[PDB]
Design a protein around this motif. Structure first.
Motif, mmCIF file in Angstrom:
data_model
loop_
_atom_site.group_PDB
_atom_site.id
_atom_site.type_symbol
_atom_site.label_atom_id
_atom_site.label_comp_id
_atom_site.label_asym_id
_atom_site.label_seq_id
_atom_site.Cartn_x
_atom_site.Cartn_y
_atom_site.Cartn_z
ATOM 1 N N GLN A 1 0.872 -1.222 -0.057
ATOM 2 C CA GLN A 1 0.095 -0.025 -0.065
ATOM 3 C C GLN A 1 0.959 1.253 -0.168
ATOM 4 O OE1 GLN A 1 -2.675 0.267 3.421
ATOM 5 N NE2 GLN A 1 -3.429 2.474 3.093
ATOM 6 N N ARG A 2 0.430 2.264 -0.646
ATOM 7 C CA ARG A 2 1.256 3.562 -0.872
ATOM 8 C C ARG A 2 1.188 4.011 0.543
ATOM 9 N NH1 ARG A 2 1.852 7.109 -6.296
ATOM 10 N NH2 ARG A 2 3.838 7.857 -5.884
ATOM 11 N N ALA A 3 2.212 4.605 1.099
ATOM 12 C CA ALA A 3 2.327 5.449 2.237
ATOM 13 C C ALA A 3 3.232 6.609 2.259
ATOM 14 C CB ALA A 3 3.057 4.476 3.393
ATOM 15 N N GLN A 4 2.444 7.689 2.194
ATOM 16 C CA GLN A 4 3.008 8.924 2.118
ATOM 17 C C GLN A 4 3.261 9.543 3.404
ATOM 18 O OE1 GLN A 4 1.419 13.448 0.844
ATOM 19 N NE2 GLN A 4 1.627 12.190 -0.981
ATOM 20 N N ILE A 5 4.778 9.510 3.799
ATOM 21 C CA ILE A 5 5.108 9.588 5.318
ATOM 22 C C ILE A 5 5.459 11.142 5.401
ATOM 23 C CG2 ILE A 5 6.594 9.080 7.089
ATOM 24 C CD1 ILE A 5 6.693 6.256 5.923
ATOM 25 N N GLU B 1 12.675 19.263 -8.902
ATOM 26 C CA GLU B 1 14.015 18.638 -9.092
ATOM 27 C C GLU B 1 13.741 17.301 -9.906
ATOM 28 O OE1 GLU B 1 16.885 19.735 -8.481
ATOM 29 O OE2 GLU B 1 16.974 21.037 -6.708
ATOM 30 N N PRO B 2 14.644 16.944 -10.556
ATOM 31 C CA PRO B 2 14.701 15.626 -11.020
ATOM 32 C C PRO B 2 14.741 14.697 -10.463
ATOM 33 C CG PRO B 2 16.857 16.609 -12.024
ATOM 34 C CD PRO B 2 16.033 17.551 -11.015
ATOM 35 N N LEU B 3 14.275 13.357 -10.750
ATOM 36 C CA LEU B 3 14.224 12.169 -10.056
ATOM 37 C C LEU B 3 15.664 12.038 -9.636
ATOM 38 C CD1 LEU B 3 12.754 9.494 -9.036
ATOM 39 C CD2 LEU B 3 13.213 8.577 -10.787
ATOM 40 N N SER B 4 16.800 12.109 -10.403
ATOM 41 C CA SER B 4 18.096 11.552 -10.404
ATOM 42 C C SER B 4 18.521 12.425 -9.079
ATOM 43 C CB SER B 4 18.935 11.991 -11.512
ATOM 44 O OG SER B 4 18.973 13.467 -11.600
ATOM 45 N N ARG B 5 18.042 13.689 -8.867
ATOM 46 C CA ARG B 5 18.238 14.512 -7.666
ATOM 47 C C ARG B 5 17.498 13.941 -6.425
ATOM 48 N NH1 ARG B 5 21.499 19.053 -7.241
ATOM 49 N NH2 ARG B 5 22.813 17.754 -8.343
ATOM 50 N N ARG B 6 16.387 13.949 -6.836
ATOM 51 C CA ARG B 6 15.450 13.556 -5.416
ATOM 52 C C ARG B 6 16.048 11.983 -4.870
ATOM 53 N NH1 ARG B 6 11.436 14.280 -9.205
ATOM 54 N NH2 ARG B 6 10.806 12.006 -8.949
ATOM 55 N N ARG B 7 16.159 11.185 -5.999
ATOM 56 C CA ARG B 7 16.520 9.928 -5.288
ATOM 57 C C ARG B 7 17.991 10.172 -4.704
ATOM 58 N NH1 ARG B 7 18.372 5.219 -10.018
ATOM 59 N NH2 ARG B 7 19.885 6.739 -10.355
ATOM 60 N N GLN B 8 19.074 10.764 -5.200
ATOM 61 C CA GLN B 8 20.174 11.117 -4.569
ATOM 62 C C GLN B 8 19.969 11.857 -3.145
ATOM 63 O OE1 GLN B 8 22.657 13.824 -6.935
ATOM 64 N NE2 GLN B 8 24.488 12.899 -5.682
ATOM 65 N N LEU B 9 19.186 12.655 -3.105
ATOM 66 C CA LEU B 9 18.779 13.094 -1.563
ATOM 67 C C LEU B 9 18.397 12.325 -0.725
ATOM 68 C CD1 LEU B 9 17.545 16.732 -2.846
ATOM 69 C CD2 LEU B 9 19.781 16.120 -1.609
ATOM 70 N N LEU B 10 17.610 11.196 -1.207
ATOM 71 C CA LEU B 10 17.051 10.149 -0.490
ATOM 72 C C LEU B 10 18.309 9.200 0.041
ATOM 73 C CD1 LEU B 10 14.809 8.356 0.591
ATOM 74 C CD2 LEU B 10 14.739 7.205 -1.601
ATOM 75 N N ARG B 11 19.024 8.972 -0.811
ATOM 76 C CA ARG B 11 19.960 8.127 -0.566
ATOM 77 C C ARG B 11 21.218 8.704 0.599
ATOM 78 N NH1 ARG B 11 20.900 5.981 -6.565
ATOM 79 N NH2 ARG B 11 19.343 4.204 -6.630
ATOM 80 N N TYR C 1 9.468 0.458 1.944
ATOM 81 C CA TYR C 1 10.225 0.576 0.631
ATOM 82 C C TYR C 1 10.054 1.704 0.278
ATOM 83 C CZ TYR C 1 10.822 -4.511 1.005
ATOM 84 O OH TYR C 1 11.091 -5.806 1.594
ATOM 85 N N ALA C 2 11.192 2.693 0.448
ATOM 86 C CA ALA C 2 11.122 4.129 -0.141
ATOM 87 C C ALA C 2 11.790 4.371 -1.518
ATOM 88 C CB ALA C 2 11.952 4.900 0.789
ATOM 89 N N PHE C 3 11.001 4.965 -2.187
ATOM 90 C CA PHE C 3 11.318 5.120 -3.753
ATOM 91 C C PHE C 3 11.153 6.507 -4.174
ATOM 92 C CE2 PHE C 3 6.655 4.074 -3.541
ATOM 93 C CZ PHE C 3 6.099 5.170 -4.203
ATOM 94 N N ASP C 4 11.122 7.654 -3.405
ATOM 95 C CA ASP C 4 11.117 9.042 -3.741
ATOM 96 C C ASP C 4 11.114 10.002 -2.374
ATOM 97 O OD1 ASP C 4 10.979 11.290 -5.217
ATOM 98 O OD2 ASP C 4 9.664 10.358 -6.809
ATOM 99 N N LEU C 5 11.622 11.197 -2.744
ATOM 100 C CA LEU C 5 11.652 12.126 -1.718
ATOM 101 C C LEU C 5 11.326 13.408 -2.367
ATOM 102 C CD1 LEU C 5 12.588 12.932 1.358
ATOM 103 C CD2 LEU C 5 14.827 13.459 0.240
ATOM 104 N N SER D 1 12.772 17.782 8.566
ATOM 105 C CA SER D 1 11.450 17.543 8.132
ATOM 106 C C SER D 1 11.510 17.181 6.618
ATOM 107 C CB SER D 1 10.617 18.898 7.908
ATOM 108 O OG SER D 1 11.151 19.780 7.158
ATOM 109 N N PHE D 2 10.556 16.203 6.567
ATOM 110 C CA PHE D 2 10.436 15.613 4.885
ATOM 111 C C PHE D 2 9.155 15.108 4.684
ATOM 112 C CE2 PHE D 2 11.797 12.294 8.037
ATOM 113 C CZ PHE D 2 10.809 11.378 7.860
ATOM 114 N N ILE D 3 9.021 14.735 3.478
ATOM 115 C CA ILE D 3 8.070 14.089 2.823
ATOM 116 C C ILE D 3 8.169 12.757 2.055
ATOM 117 C CG2 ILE D 3 5.753 13.956 1.418
ATOM 118 C CD1 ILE D 3 5.513 16.950 2.294
ATOM 119 N N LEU D 4 8.589 11.536 2.381
ATOM 120 C CA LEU D 4 8.634 10.362 2.003
ATOM 121 C C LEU D 4 7.778 9.745 1.034
ATOM 122 C CD1 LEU D 4 10.895 8.492 4.445
ATOM 123 C CD2 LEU D 4 11.604 9.679 2.246
ATOM 124 N N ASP D 5 7.915 9.113 -0.069
ATOM 125 C CA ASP D 5 7.219 8.199 -0.992
ATOM 126 C C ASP D 5 7.599 6.761 -0.826
ATOM 127 O OD1 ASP D 5 4.895 7.872 -2.605
ATOM 128 O OD2 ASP D 5 5.616 9.054 -4.270
#
Ligand SMILES: *OP(=O)(O)OC[C@H]1O[C@@H](n2cnc3c(N)ncnc32)[C@H](O)[C@@H]1O
Ligand code: NA
Length: 645
Positions: A315-319, A416-426, A401-405, A358-362
DNA sequence: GCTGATGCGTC
DNA sequence: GTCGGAC
DNA sequence: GTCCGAGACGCATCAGC
């Protein structure tokens, strides 16, 4: 004064003037019949732009004459009680509604049900209904806000005997209904307005309305059509820009209770200054477009580099993590599920570095077996309590299982492009096995390496792959494109997955666009042991409008008055028309599940529960097969076992 | 107290 | 969730 | 391509028993 009776209100007329063509006076409550008449004009046209223009005309009159009623009018147009996160539920379906119509008419509940099924619309029954309530005092005409207030009154009624309290309010509404009001009040309570116009078109009409007729003017408004001074080309461009301002704002703050006040006090052009993405306010999530093969993926993502990620079955969980420590979790539909995941709340300190404020995680919440350290089926996930007070009582653990920030340390990452969002997530979040993990991903365009990855994802208990661009059109701007990702599921591939040949044993009358014909069908497998047909699932999608009209004309000749003795449906919804078993249809599904109602293959996997199909769709008729050659219950059980591995 | 129908959300 | 239809 | 409106099954609620 303007004494135009609302019955003659025409928001679809040429050269509509917000003040003079309204069916109410300045400072008067918007009549609900004005909204109904607008709905009528909208449902009789098929072009979205024509529907938007019509609704926009109503909204301009409301802005000019009755600003306080703009919010209830919008919610009625959307068939919503309020922001999705407030968890308002009418508690009224066709059951309660049809019961209310019966008492308001003196009819038996069964008669009203049959008629509603025949017509495929409760609104047409409530309109052609002779009212039994011999009231001795003519009631005042319904108002848009008054009807909206009664709908919320219905929602707030809880506890024992609340149903009869809800029915009394509904009955009171119908006794005051005039012309087509009863039709749309019933449709609203049913949840099926059938307008052909929804969220996206309501926003377009709203942005157009406040752009053409700016709010906040001194009455009479000197500026009623701000497009008159523009050329058609400039007008179109101007309205598209204003529309995007509203769309993108709403996508980040889908809460009209917050947008409309700002809109009425500062105007649409200044809306972004007072409403923006913030933790604690859910936002619209990015969705995926179905793709039927790896080849199609390269076509849609020609040139642009992309990544593939496991599509987990959860289930999608927007945290949301607010500045201060407050944590909130929302669903795909902006519903608040914070109370459902006390184990995730207590987990947030473990997933972030000390610099994350603070954050919003997908993420995807997936049922997790800590003993075996393995993903569990989605079915196990749905057995969690919706309000777990103590995390110590939870029996089905979940791994995130996080896949976006989307938001970090007070800054929105939507552009921001996914490449950057993904990078900020990691770089800013920390993994923990079986509790918080980054989605398994792969960056490549080698077709061979993608097919292998797709296979491994299925072996690792996933539906397939998500494909997302890294830098070209790779932002999180839902107003620009809501389905910017691509999903490649195992069952999308031609010749892969579960395909069954099932016997049609019953038909259900259609609703709305399906009215006057069959909207669904009851399918069965052949149990060769007892020589009986066992219902397995219903079917209501996968055929064209032309195929479905031929199914209607053909199966009509098979209608039986009573079921054959060798047809077992047990707990399935009794079909409106029993069909002599004859037609065999090829059906595809995503999975097979242990059913609490369907008897198909009962006793071949479990003593009490049979088997059903998850997300079945029609493929083609099997004219070369009779019922005796349909997929057997034994084969259904074998199929179900091949899954559990 | 218990069952089953109803409502609504998840996919 | 899936699917098809009108634009 | 967008937008819209045509399945199984779980928990939670509540009417009937
Ligand atoms: O079929 P659908 O459109 O609901 O698919 C989208 C949903 O898939 C889930 N999911 C699982 N894993 C991912 C990744 N890695 N990225 C995006 N979505 C993912 C989500 O719940 C989503 O809504
Ligand atoms: Na068409």
């Amino acid at each position: 004064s303007n004494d135009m009776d609302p019955s003659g209100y025409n928001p679809a007329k040429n050269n509509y003037h917000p003040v003079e063509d309204a069916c109410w006076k300045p400072g008067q409550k918007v009549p609900y019949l004005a909204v109904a008449r607008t709905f009528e004009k909208i449902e009789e046209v098929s072009a979205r732009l024509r529907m938007v223009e019509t609704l926009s005309n109503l909204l301009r009159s409301v802005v000019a004459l009755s600003p306080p009623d703009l919010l209830p009018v919008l919610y009625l147009s959307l068939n919503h009680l309020g922001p999705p996160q407030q968890g308002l539920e009418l508690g009224v379906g066709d059951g309660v509604l049809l019961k209310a119509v019966a008492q308001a008419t003196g009819r038996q509940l069964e008669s009203v049900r049959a008629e509603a099924a025949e017509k495929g619309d409760v609104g047409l029954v409530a309109e052609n209904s002779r009212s039994t309530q011999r009231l001795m005092l003519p009631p005042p005409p319904l108002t848009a806000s008054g009807v909206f207030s009664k709908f919320r009154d219905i929602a707030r009624l809880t506890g024992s005997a609340s149903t009869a309290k809800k029915i009394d309010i509904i009955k009171g509404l119908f006794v005051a209904c005039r012309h087509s009001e009863a039709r749309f009040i019933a449709r609203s309570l049913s949840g099926r307005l059938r307008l052909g116009l929804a969220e996206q078109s309501v926003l377009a009409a709203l942005s157009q309305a406040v752009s053409l007729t700016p709010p906040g003017q001194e009455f009479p408004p000197a500026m009623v059509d701000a497009g008159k001074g523009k050329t058609a080309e400039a007008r179109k461009t101007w309205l598209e820009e204003q529309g995007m301002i509203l769309k993108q704002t709403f996508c980040e703050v889908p809460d009209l209770d917050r947008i409309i006040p700002v809109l009425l006090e500062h105007g649409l052009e200044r809306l972004p200054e007072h409403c923006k993405l913030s933790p604690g306010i859910p936002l619209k999530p990015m969705l995926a477009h179905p793709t039927r093969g790896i080849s199609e993926v390269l076509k849609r993502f020609e040139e642009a580099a992309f990544t593939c990620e496991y599509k987990y079955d959860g289930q999608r969980a927007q945290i949301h993590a607010l500045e201060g420590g407050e944590v909130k979790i929302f669903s795909r539909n902006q519903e608040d599920n914070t109370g459902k995941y006390p184990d995730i709340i207590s987990r947030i300190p473990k997933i972030k570095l000390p610099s994350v404020t603070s954050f919003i995680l997908d993420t995807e919440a997936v049922a997790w077996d800590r003993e075996k350290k393995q993903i569990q089926p989605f079915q196990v996930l749905t057995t969690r309590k919706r309000k777990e007070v103590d995390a110590s009582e939870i029996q089905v653990q979940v791994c995130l299982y996080a896949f976006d920030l989307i938001y970090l340390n007070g800054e929105s990452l939507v552009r921001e492009p996914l490449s950057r969002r993904r990078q900020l997530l990691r770089e800013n979040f920390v993994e923990t096995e079986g509790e918080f993990v980054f989605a398994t991903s792969l960056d490549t365009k080698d077709i061979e390496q993608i097919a292998e990855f797709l296979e491994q994802s299925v072996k690792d208990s996933c539906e397939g792959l998500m494909v997302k661009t890294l830098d070209v059109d790779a932002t999180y701007e839902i107003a620009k494109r809501s389905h910017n990702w691509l999903k490649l599921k195992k069952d999308y591939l031609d010749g892969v997955g579960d395909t069954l040949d099932l016997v049609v044993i019953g038909a259900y009358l259609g609703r709305g666009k399906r009215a006057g014909r069959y909207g669904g069908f009851l399918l069965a497998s052949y149990d060769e042991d007892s020589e009986e047909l066992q219902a397995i699932c219903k079917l209501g999608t996968g055929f064209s409008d032309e195929e479905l009209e031929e199914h209607h004309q053909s199966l009509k000749a098979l209608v039986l008055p009573s079921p054959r003795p060798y047809v077992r449906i047990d707990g399935a919804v009794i079909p409106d028309h029993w069909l002599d078993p004859s037609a065999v249809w090829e059906v595809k599904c995503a999975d097979l599940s242990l059913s609490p109602i369907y008897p198909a293959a009962r006793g071949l996997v479990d003593s009490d529960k049979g088997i059903s199909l998850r997300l079945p769709r029609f493929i083609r008729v099997r004219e070369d097969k009779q019922p005796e050659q349909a997929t057997t219950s034994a084969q259904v059980a074998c199929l179900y076992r091949k899954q559990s591995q």
